[model samples]
Target chain A: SLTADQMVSALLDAEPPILYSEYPFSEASMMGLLTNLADRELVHMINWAKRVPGFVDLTLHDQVHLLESAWLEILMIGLVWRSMEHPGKLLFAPNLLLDRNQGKSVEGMVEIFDMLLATSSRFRMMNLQGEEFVCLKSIILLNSGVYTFTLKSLEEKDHIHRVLDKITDTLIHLMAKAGLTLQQQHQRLAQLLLILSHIRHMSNKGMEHLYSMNVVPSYDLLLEMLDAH
Target chain B: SLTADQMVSALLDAEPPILYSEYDFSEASMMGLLTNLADRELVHMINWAKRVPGFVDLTLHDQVHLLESAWLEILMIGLVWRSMEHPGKLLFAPNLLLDRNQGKSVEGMVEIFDMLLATSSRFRMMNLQGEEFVCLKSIILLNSGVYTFLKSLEEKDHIHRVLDKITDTLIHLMAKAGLTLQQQHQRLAQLLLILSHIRHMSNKGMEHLYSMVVPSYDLLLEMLD
Candidate 1:
């Protein structure tokens, strides 16, 4: 039998992060070079989400909304993995390194870095195994409407709810496979859900920051992801 | 006679933001401490909202619930306004400049700070005036509930009239800020978009706060609800 962890690794390993660290960044430089490398990263993230298998099973509308909502979330997923070894610094791009101090110089840098540093810190604290991180990221790929400004029309139906069910069980099943008691299973799942909250928070804030900065082409473009394979 | 800026200044004057200069925080610091300062600021914000003239008329419950639901959004309103002068730094406390490096060390600092930073930056770009900022805050507080919930709390007419007064004054601030009819479109759209984004943040924030590893999620619970 294929272990649950193996399934997640295969899916995640298919899409390693898109690294574009070539931008020339200075200590407190202005927006041009900053946003140029920045905006393209978002396109890479949304594209990665769409490539995830079973993600295609979701309705096109749900798929669009999910990726749009989860864009920053998925971005953090890979960032967390990359930065896991480097607790004090966050991976802004492949070559880019945003240390605790450098983070302060950017606009809204406080908020982004707070979540960035704190989230990875918590992920490390939880001692999330590679497979567990993979499963959690799996959930993130198709994850949303767990909050506001989401798939307003679709999340309500019984059929669509199976999507919710799918997300829940994936984690729960992961727990059971690890040989935890019913109580521990519930507890671990609760903790995982909380981490997901930080993910959602980071994504929501990231979208707003990037949108305000006006780096991305248009909100509607990122909102709908009308481009394709 | 009072301008929009004057109103915001007068209303917000009593509730000065709290500061924490002595506490050295790192990302390794407890989220409980961060949420505590944030939650306290929110308490002051709600009391300030009550200070808005017509607010006293709403039943105690409406004021409370509306404030509860709108809690995170309003916290952002003030933080954004405060951050306007300090683009790269946040006015974290009464007299503190919280830079990114300092912020990074705080748990979930990115989430809260980013939303606050982006929002204020957007306001600055739109050149939101003091009076307009005042009106916008009042409107968001009065914004909870539907038309049905609207009539119960006060009146659709009451809420509309307040915003109407606010917006009308805002029109002057608009021309004063030098926005054309087209920019006003972008201006108003940008303003509302920020609110909806806050709406998203609030939902996500509430979830984060609910299960947050903390000293007292209860304090946050009391502050927001």
Candidate 2:
């Protein structure tokens, strides 16, 4: 069983290296560049998911399905988390910074960018920290079934539920270590979970746009996750 | 030696309970109300300073002097820390919420309130956590000599320096536990120290105004310490 610190360490270590795209800012290249960056992030997200505490304990089918269902939400979260420090911009990679006006180059991108930028701004205001990010990322993973119907058995469901509870408990413990009073912890935890609901809306709306546009590369795993051919 | 967790726990326990005033919004009553509240908070601030780890290790003179020099700054820090969550207003206490306009009634208060609110806004943007606040509070206490000439011997200075270093190291440790990479921690630590300098300016300006105005209650211990 990984301790809370260890779990956070694992997630941090598994983060995608800063990667940049060389494409200049024409409409055609901008979409390609973003699609390419997201693909790269997706690759790292899968690797990171495997490293999550208790993730490997699930059956292989459940493991694959969990990622398949929740990868979009988690990827957006990572994107928003990274963009938090850079106000009014989306930091897709170290070198890739896009502001609101920049997103106007692509037709539908402005809406998607608005959603992400709003969430990033909100997270910034809440003063979200690394420990909280790690726990929230894990929670999003375990709670993927919240959106889609689950195919697992009673036994598997019970195991997954326990893992979710364990991660949630670690989040509260981290808040305690961060020196929040119990009252503060309770208030913040509620706010964080409410943000998760907002993220769910973002993922669904983002997924709808991406699926319609067929913008992402056809990497087998990426295609499978997005349900694109 | 107190562990980092225990040190933070001590700080949480030592916090002044939220206190409010009953005076209405007229300029005269507002001044009096604020002065009265400051006196009460000053009492709790003194109690909190005495409980700081290694504070007792200092000479009695040093202990009293440290608080005397830095109490205004620490009070402002506590005020700013509490106000971080409440955007656009100062949460002097749970019940006393004042916006930018409210300070207009009291002469020279607008400048003081602006300074406090700006620092609070900056702290909110920094996402400063509780452990960080505790460490910073302790650091402010130990480093009070930064503003004034020290009257202490070499041995005493060395002791105070060591205490400052310990609290500073705990701050870094808390950042690590909060899962900041070394790079992130370095960046944030520098930013926090910069904010401390900003706070130093606020305290000096604040003390000058309050001293000249003579609005604070002349509680002898409050006046003396």
Candidate 3:
């Protein structure tokens, strides 16, 4: 029953990240560290979604479906946003910074690692603010249209979109309030919205890379979310 | 029915490589060339397995189960054996030569290509011959004891092992070609042991193929899946 502003406010505070780790630069160490951070983030993300205004109103199946479908992309939002000030590396968590050269040590990871750095650079270019970042994260999470959303029926799709529309409205409202003229708001909003497509593409490429990853997440919830075989 | 020697002789002559292509040395082109060669070999392997003396004696379920499980490793046998005389290059076909430096152009292939080269070097050191190579190929195709062998029952294992044992003995007898009883035993042991190596390489190859985000042939796709 929270307002859109309230949901954004709450989610911004939600990921004070209950997690990081110290691991060497080896592929096994880096992947394990990333896996650990991913598991920790999933716990916060699941709990955070329960409070995302109307998100809980959907059927449980649809709720879980949306989360699984959008989890990696959601993580991408966090990873890209957090790394914005870091310039050259991915701030996978507070303490873990992965640069491009070290990423190549892991076979098949150079492409994905570079993709993340590129997305982060684009986000920085747009001078993305905190409120915009939160709204975008919620929008991406609730974006049931891409990747893996096989909604059971029309009602399910309608309910989810209704929830999604609330977050999108919040984004538009915040963009207006940021001391920008109407024209400027529209221009920035288009750029902000367009980045989701790149984010979606990056998430898919991440999943493909994860397919052959050497490490396994010990978190069953995370594993189930990944739909790993 | 074809005898063991007859099957070996037939298969040895089967892969006079129906085809190969020339493409510029880029990741895209190398992968395309390699994939084309894989598809072509799969057809030959599929056809060759059907003629492998007693292979069709099993239920259709088990026959396919064995082929699908062993397809990649069987190809590994051919790639490794064919490349033995070439050194440092995988003779994916008669005209398609891929070396370590060229393999690096494709992501995640260096490790697998090196393993293939290493297997080839070992085979060469052993002075591995045509009969042993062909028998080893059959043995590998029928070695359902590893990787993706989800046999439906004991009867399937019995039938597969019966066929496998025939080729396994052929390898041992062929190893007796120019060596003492003890030397033959050692040579057979070394050959059998490398199947483990080949199987490991086959698994890595499958993972690489899966991660290729990749591919187009139905037989190749079905086997890869």
| Candidate number that wins on lDDT, 1 or 2 | 2
For the predicted complex of model 3, DockQ is 0.01
Instruction: List native contact recovery per candidate, as a fraction of 1.
Output: 0.02, 0.00, 0.00
lDDT digits (tens) for residues A98-215 of candidate 3: 7898888877888878778877876786688888887777767666332123335556655655565566556656766777764354345544654564566566567768886633
lDDT of each residue in A1-229, candidate 2, tens digit only: 6676776677677665666766435665777777777777777676677777777677666667677657788888888998999999999877788899988976677887888887897688779998788878887787654222244645665676556656656666778898987545544554465466457556666765787674443345544553423
Predictions ranked by DockQ, top down?
1, 2, 3
Cα error, residue A21 of model 2, in Å, equals 2.2
Give the Cα error of residue B182 in candidate 2, in Å. 32
DockQ, candidate 1, vs. native dimer? 0.03
Show the lowest summed lDDT stretch of 10 residues, model 2 chain B.
B182-191
List, residue by residue over B1-225, the lDDT tens digit for candidate 1.
456556556555645455553364444444555566675666677567767756656666555655654567676677678788889677755545677667676466567566667666657766776666776676667653321133562454455445444554545556667766434433443354355455556655565566452224355335434
Candidate 3 local distance difference test against the native = 0.65
DockQ for each model = 0.03, 0.01, 0.01
Q: What tens-digit string does per-residue lDDT give for candidate 2 at B53-92? A: 7776766655666666566667778888999999879888
Which lDDT value does model 1 have at B35?
68
Model 3 CA deviation exceeding 4 Å by range: A1-4, A16-18, A22-28, A145-152, A214-229, B1-225
Best by DockQ: 1
By summed lDDT, the worst window of 10 consecutive residues in model 3 chain B runs over B144-153
TM-score of chain B of each: 0.72, 0.80, 0.82
